[PDB]
Design a protein around this ligand. Structure first.
Ligand SMILES: *OCCCCCCNc1c(NCCOCCO[C@H]2O[C@H](CO)[C@@H](O)[C@H](O)[C@@H]2O)c(=O)c1=O
Ligand SMILES: *OCCCCCCNc1c(NCCOCCO[C@H]2O[C@H](CO)[C@@H](O)[C@H](O)[C@@H]2O)c(=O)c1=O
Ligand SMILES: *OCCCCCCNc1c(NCCOCCO[C@H]2O[C@H](CO)[C@@H](O)[C@H](O)[C@@H]2O)c(=O)c1=O
Ligand SMILES: *OCCCCCCNc1c(NCCOCCO[C@H]2O[C@H](CO)[C@@H](O)[C@H](O)[C@@H]2O)c(=O)c1=O
Ligand SMILES: [Ca+2]
Ligand SMILES: [Ca+2]
Ligand SMILES: [Ca+2]
Ligand SMILES: [Ca+2]
Ligand SMILES: [Mn+2]
Ligand SMILES: [Mn+2]
Ligand SMILES: [Mn+2]
Ligand SMILES: [Mn+2]
Lengths: 231, 231, 232, 232
DNA sequence: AAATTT
DNA sequence: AAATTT
DNA sequence: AAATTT
DNA sequence: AAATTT
């Protein structure tokens, strides 16, 4: 199996696998059962912003998710990523639907990593039809309105159930090194989750994986395109 | 009195005012009596690097100080800087000598601040004779070898005792705002502390202050050009 | 008198001082009489973007101004800024109105300067607060209204006033050139909203570089754009 | 055949294929026969810096190469890269030796590309590790030796070998131009150490931009710099 | 998040 | 750039 | 950090 | 750009 560290924006409570009873943000270390969660007032139809940060000094993975004119949700977990991730990784965005569904639209995505200095930075404020610096997996597409659609959306603009897709940055990323004084990363993305159903599902995740990571077979719904099972 | 938050590289133990019995790095919140310290193996004559980081999510001020081919020293303190600093500040470097002395040479200095986005970034890898974007206070000079000398150094290159000087970035910095989702800063500087005396003193500090801050009268030696007294 | 280098977005043709017969973008080297101009299809009430670039290798000051879904206007002029500007400068935005008027609203402003090893400065304003301590506001310029910078006077309902002039300068001096530098470069970007009830909106917005102690010249409303003491 | 745009630091004059009679810097548009060259006082055994710049407004590819306390060499060529390169490219460093030889050591490399609202990419290498997974190494190129990138073969005591060619390409494709972009720009910087026991060191280093699937052309040691399949 | 069961 | 060919 | 005092 | 002066 892949090695996955993720931040989940989980729109749907799967209480059978440890989700709290409300939409939440969570920190996922090699399991869909979040090591840490916080309540998230997801706003159907509104553009949200997610901010993820980590540095080798505090070794604390932190995320903040917000909408304009609303209180943020924030979650943090103390984890030494040198003990979890390989030295080289790919970074990406994942989303899924199940028997309930939602648009999982990404409007922008930026990432910065630094090791003390070697740096990498990318910013996408628009996605083109042929975005050669992204690896699209499963149902993910680019070019529609200059957005990245992680999960399948029909020609009438309706989201489809039982969909999964991911976008990974083409270049491997040097996320830690034994000889580094300080290492840090940050990621930012803006997203639009819309459901015509009473209940949106299943969520979006920022993730870091082994370089050769692929969607686990059957990872639609509550597995968010990240995990082969709910252990 | 000014409002000061600083990271001290304290070369000289002033045990009468709570310094530990060894050269240390410390986090100073409105007092020279550090809220937190760590042991620092200062290397007389060698170029060192200091890295300071803070963000509004973790509200943890952290510093790392290192030399090539040596173990780092690191110190962190949980502090909400919105409760300590004014919304607008100046950032700077301070150094002092007393009855013992050292060169307090800065080879480079960079700073970045971001509020969610408004950003400010400066980098100095060399200092010119007439560096109009620095406010030099007390004995601080620029232009000698392209370095910033925070404290007085005679024409034969010998450091002088009972010296204090500071360099502040000209523009005020927006360090926090009630309406910001995320706020962060980082600072990096490289430094050369040399003493021909058995004992170097007194140290270098990165500091953040009220915009109109000036060297407190008599703040040579253990007060590091930051505090009017040892309370 | 100040030393000024500017890029003008000139909404109003002052034919008596060398302006062409249409709204234009111009490069101004120590004179309101542009060394170079290009036709500019200014879109009343629409958000525009201006991009200014220079480097010590090409020694060409270039600007592009655009609106979404419309053709850009671009102008370039070969000038060695080492022979024109002092080594240390302030950078800023200026705007004016006269008999005719317009909102001179700035929604965002960013600047980067680098000298090569490397000295750099970068600022970005995507919002302006009521108390923007890293800006020097001159004349009628105000911040805080909808998070925007209003270079010239507007009323409580957002209606522009005539006979207005204001400027915003970045607080820190900028090291724009150095004789011992291998490469020096700058870029600036700003987004702007020029809106007018008038048949002919006036007078325009400029990005400028000046001596550090520059102030609005006395009487510099209307066609002088808050930059020049006269039309020479 | 690949599509190549390069800046050559050409240490060896191949007069039979249009090189001038001295070490030169050149701009190469789909040919080893530079569209433009300038004299280059290459300093055997000293660390040099190369700076390459381009933007879609001036459409001028410019380079500067310098050593500390010495006069720069600079070359520029007016070219619209939209008419030459594919929209997506890889960027890289190439070097070669032939009968004569030199170390082609890279100490650092950085690149920035931006399309305007804005898409950006930036990387910086100030050290190279033994397993540099975000570089595609081609031919003799190796990383890890003193934290440097060695584009061509050197021995365990650091002595250069003849008849060598290697390249390092950034792993991710780069969006170098787009028809709907207002402004597009790139810059690259690298520091290099060219050292030789030979009377005439050869053959040089190049920064290049290519089709994403570019490889060292067969036989491209010596004067072809690992870029061109022939001297046309 | 709102019924339906123990 | 230096030697050799024409 | 190394003496000098309790 | 439109009106008025020369
Ligand atoms: O505040 C709570 C509002 C949202 C919950 C309202 C509906 N809840 C609910 C459940 N719960 C049991 C979960 O099973 C549902 C079906 O599972 C499939 O679909 C989901 C969503 O796409 C996915 O996570 C699973 O992996 C799977 O594909 C109901 O049965 C019901 O109604
Ligand atoms: O690992 C420890 C090595 C360094 C200490 C060795 C010398 N210690 C020492 C002291 N301690 C008492 C402190 O007073 C010294 C004089 O104080 C003046 O000088 C210092 C240094 O510049 C400064 O912090 C003060 O503010 C003041 O200016 C001795 O008396 C002695 O010897
Ligand atoms: O074909 C497209 C437009 C052509 C020109 C239209 C000009 N209309 C116009 C003029 N022209 C004379 C210019 O000065 C008159 C007013 O001068 C004052 O106002 C302007 C604008 O604020 C300013 O630049 C000056 O400095 C001064 O304050 C008219 O008189 C008229 O109507
Ligand atoms: O006045 C300053 C230098 C002037 C030229 C000096 C050249 N010396 C020289 C030549 N010239 C003929 C060129 O080709 C000979 C060797 O060709 C092989 O080696 C080079 C260098 O590695 C390479 O560019 C080629 O592609 C080929 O591999 C001599 O024969 C000689 O000596
Ligand atoms: Ca879930
Ligand atoms: Ca002390
Ligand atoms: Ca005008
Ligand atoms: Ca050659
Ligand atoms: Mn969950
Ligand atoms: Mn201390
Ligand atoms: Mn004009
Ligand atoms: Mn050549």
């Amino acid at each position: 199996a892949d090695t996955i560290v993720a931040v989940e924006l989980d729109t749907y409570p799967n209480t059978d696998i440890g989700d709290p009873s409300y939409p939440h943000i969570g920190i996922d270390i090699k399991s869909v059962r979040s090591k840490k969660t916080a309540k998230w007032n997801m706003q159907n139809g509104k553009v949200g912003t997610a901010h993820i940060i980590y540095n080798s000094v505090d070794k604390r993975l932190s995320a903040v998710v917000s909408y304009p004119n609303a209180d943020s949700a924030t979650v943090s977990y103390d984890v030494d990523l040198d003990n979890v991730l390989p030295e080289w990784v790919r970074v990406g965005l994942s989303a899924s639907t199940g028997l309930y569904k939602e648009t999982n639209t990404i409007l922008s995505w930026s990432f910065t990593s630094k090791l003390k200095t070697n740096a990498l930075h990318f910013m996408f404020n628009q996605f083109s039809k042929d975005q050669k610096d992204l690896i699209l997996q499963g149902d993910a597409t680019t070019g529609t309105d200059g957005n990245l659609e992680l999960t399948r959306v029909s020609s009438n603009g309706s989201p489809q159930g039982s969909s999964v897709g991911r976008a990974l940055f083409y270049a491997p990323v040097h996320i830690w090194e034994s000889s580094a004084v300080v290492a840090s990363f940050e990621a930012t993305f803006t997203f639009l989750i819309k459901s015509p159903d009473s209940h949106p599902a299943d969520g979006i995740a920022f993730f870091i994986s082994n370089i050769d990571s692929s969607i686990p077979s059957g990872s639609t719904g509550r597995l968010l395109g990240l995990f082969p099972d709910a252990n």
